[PDB]
Amino acid sequence: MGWMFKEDHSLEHRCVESAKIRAKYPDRVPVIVEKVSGSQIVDIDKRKYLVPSDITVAQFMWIIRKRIQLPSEKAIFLFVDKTVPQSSLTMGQLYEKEKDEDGFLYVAYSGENTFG
């Protein structure tokens, strides 16, 4: 699809917000979550999700599905940099290793297993 944030304003915003977030919440990682177009799942608002570096991918994933209230009838899958992250990996580790030029993380979700 494309990055809505990157189209509108990212570099300046991400720089200032990263400084504020690192200063106030040094133990948290700044993530952006978007709904992949075409799947049957509910849509997501434009929000800046700040998760503690202590939790694992398993907990973060479970929170995204619980927040959007994913029923047992549908499935939910996550994607980061075109890869399937390991649920047991730590938020801080995945953040530091995948740390972008703007020091933020981009995660997309789908409610289908085959995106085509």
């Binding site: 944030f5 200032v16 977030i21 919440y25 948290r28 608002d45 700040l50 503690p52 927040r67």
Partner: peptide
């Protein structure tokens, strides 16, 4: 520098999440 225009299209509200 802080081009925080009053015309923001995409909101991007901060949300601290943990569980």
């Amino acid at each position: 520098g802080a081009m925080e225009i009053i015309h923001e299209d995409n909101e991007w509200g901060i949300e601290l999440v943990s569980e």
